[PDB]
């Protein structure tokens, strides 16, 4: 039993809820919040921009120390950084942008980083100003994850379209 509320079972493990992940976060204090980054871990809009406004900025001053340190990410890849006032963890997860051209087939590399954390509190990746079919997103979040994961999805319009879609 975990503390998540309002939730739509999609499957064994996953989840879905038309929710603010901010606002969500902030609420259940979840032991892993998952952001959609970039691999310059430069959160400036779209769901990395909301995570680090509600910390104050104080997560990007973190990345920024952890790019000097170490480079970029991959594309598929991640890393576990602070969650801040938001989570225990949070894991930033380079999702496609397609708006950038780059390859789609990296979405389910991306999705498997969850595999890593039992429970984790997360958008669907690459949708949004990354540019995928969130349709798309849902399906290989389904099929790729093992773990337990809940969904937050911001936009009511999109929620009930993924809902209703979904096989
Ligand atoms: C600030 C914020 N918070 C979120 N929490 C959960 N999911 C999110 N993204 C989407 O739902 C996909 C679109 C944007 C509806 C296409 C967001 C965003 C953008």
Known sequence: VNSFSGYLKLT??????????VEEA??????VVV?????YLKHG??????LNKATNNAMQVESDDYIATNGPLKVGGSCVLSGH???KHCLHVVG?????????QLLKSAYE?????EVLLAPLLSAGIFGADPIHSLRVCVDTVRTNVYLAVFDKNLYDKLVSSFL
């Open 12 to 21: 064994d493990n996953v989840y879905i809820k038309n929710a603010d992940i």
């Open 26 to 31: 902030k609420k259940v204090k979840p032991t």
């Open 35 to 39: 952001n959609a980054a970039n691999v």
């Open 45 to 50: 809009g779209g769901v990395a921009g909301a």
């Open 85 to 87: 006032n938001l989570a």
């Open 96 to 104: 496609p942008n397609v708006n950038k051209g780059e390859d789609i």
């Open 113 to 117: 980083n969850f595999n890593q954390h």
